[PDB]
Amino acid sequence: MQTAYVKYVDDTTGETLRQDDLHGYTDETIPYSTAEGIKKYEGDGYVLVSDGFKPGTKFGVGTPTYEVHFKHGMTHTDATDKNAEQKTVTETIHYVDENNQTVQPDSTTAVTFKRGYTTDNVTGKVVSYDPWTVDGNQADSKTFAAVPSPAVEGYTPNHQQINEFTVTPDSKDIVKTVVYVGDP
Secondary structure, eight states: OEEEEEEEEETTTOOEEEEEEEEEOTTSBOOOOSHHHHHHHHTTTEEEEEEOOOTTOBOOSSOOEEEEEEEEOEEEEOTTSTTSEEEEEEEEEEEEOTTOOOSEEEEEEEEEEEEOEEEETTTOSEEEEOOOEETTEEOSOEEEOOEEOOOOTTEEESSSEEOOEEEOTTOOOEEEEEEEEEOO
């Protein structure tokens, strides 16, 4: 009674997923197909790479192993997708007086960093990230244009303008207050 092995391998991790031990007499057709197995692992997120078994294969005399190789499926989500990773850093300028009351409308400017990534279909964990993008262009930071405090006759602000500031996706929002002093 001969033996034949059918070995399903995950090339990604290197592990064996399944091994089928088949038995029969020399010269008969092995009552087996790799169909069902391959179907089951594809539903798991795996991708076929090669299938060494072939229908019509008979039992000989050795102890042969036939291999079916798989790799992990990959799903790419890119920066324009709803699922992209997004980080927003905003800057707010308040314009007040001695009583901390509104003398000029707020200056507000926002930057949204977006990036795609790749997920492993089998494990479900993410394996890489695409470069950070700002409005569809590759960038890891952005400088906020320095903002000039507007002119209010009767007052003079304690900062003529607030500077440029560079921000990364990680950065904390910017809150800066300008105080206008009444003309003595």
